[PDB]
A paper describes a structure:
Herein we provide evidence that Ca2+- and redox-dependent regulation is directly linked within one protein, involved in the regulation of photosynthetic redox regulation and oxidative stress defense. This protein is designated as calredoxin (CRX, Cre03.g202950.t1.1) and consists of 4 EF-hands that are functionally connected to a TRX domain. In this work we characterized functional properties of CRX, which is conserved in the green algae lineage but absent in vascular plants. In this work we characterized a protein designated as CRX, representing a new class of Ca2+-dependent ‘sensor-responder' proteins.
The phases of the native crystal data were obtained by the molecular replacement method and the structure was refined to 1.6 Å resolution. Molecules A and B contained 313 and 310 amino acid residues, respectively, except for flexible regions, four calcium ions in each CRX molecule and 1,156 water molecules in total. In the CaM domain, one calcium ion was bound in each EF-hand loop located in the N- and C-subdomains, respectively. The TRX domain exhibited the typical TRX fold, possessing four α-helices (H10–H13) and one mixed β-sheet. There were two hydrogen bond networks between the active site of the TRX domain and the Ca4 binding site. This is an intriguing aspect as the structure of the TRX domain showed noteworthy similarity to the conventional TRX molecule (r.m.s.d=1.36 Å for Cα atoms of spinach TRX f), strongly suggesting that the Ca2+-dependent activity of CRX is modulated via the inter-domain communication path which is absent in TRX f.
Residue numbers in the entry: 18 to 189, 195 to 335
Write the structure that this text describes.
Amino acid sequence: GLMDDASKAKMEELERRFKMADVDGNGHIDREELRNLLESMESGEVYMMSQHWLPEDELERCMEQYDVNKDGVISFEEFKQIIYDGLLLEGTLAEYESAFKAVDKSGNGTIGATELSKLFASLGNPVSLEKLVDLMQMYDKDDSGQIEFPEFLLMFRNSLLDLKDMTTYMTLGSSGSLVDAVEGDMTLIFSEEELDALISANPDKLVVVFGALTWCRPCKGMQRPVQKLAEHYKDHIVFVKLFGNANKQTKRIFKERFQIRSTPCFITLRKGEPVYTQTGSNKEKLEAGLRSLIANPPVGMIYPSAEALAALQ
Ligand SMILES: [Ca+2]
Ligand SMILES: [Ca+2]
Ligand SMILES: [Ca+2]
Ligand SMILES: [Ca+2]
């Protein structure tokens, strides 16, 4: 009775919303009613009932937090906290589909790390490759090496992205590829399918795989060197970076395909086959080794060593 009118209206609306989510009308929100409430669009007003898209982890994640008394069900008071914390998708299915298509510059229907990097950089918040690893670990939950639509949705649920970033990005032909390398720059990959695509796309260049780990310090020291070699040697060599520990696929590439035992590791592929392997932080040795594979290398070295310089002849 003694609530103010504005508060009474807010509460009446939360009550209306709660009753809507409580589909069976039984007075509360169980785990399976909450699954659909989390799968919904337009602030709980449109349920996508074709089939489920939310991973089970996510629902359990949600009950863990908002079920405070631990009776396996969501009460009205607990439901308010879900609303306040912004868990429901506010946009329409079409707005999320438009945003996904905008980010998927290749137009193949999935978002790769290279695409994510461009989105962040284009919006003035360029991210490091190590941070792209973190984004993929947090959102590529099926270890596909791509962000599919349902995973993109969780970027909005968690406020990593906002539908205004998207409108801005839209303001700023397509290949159809899984990955499109940027000439002169290393490509960070998250799947074997991307590795193979890059090899197939570069039949007449050497492909150098830079294997790193996210906590490896000497690896970090080689990142700037490799960026300079990727520019200098672009007519001859494409570089492809993978962090072995990123996901199930990268672990397998490290252990089964290349048998990488120490990092940083540089594996040079000719027509997809390892022909030259070097490990560690010796830049002079790495570059001399790469150069020895090239008929007509660029003039000048980035990391000369006395030995690597031709005598006056
Ligand atoms: Ca119910
Ligand atoms: Ca509860
Ligand atoms: Ca794409
Ligand atoms: Ca995925």
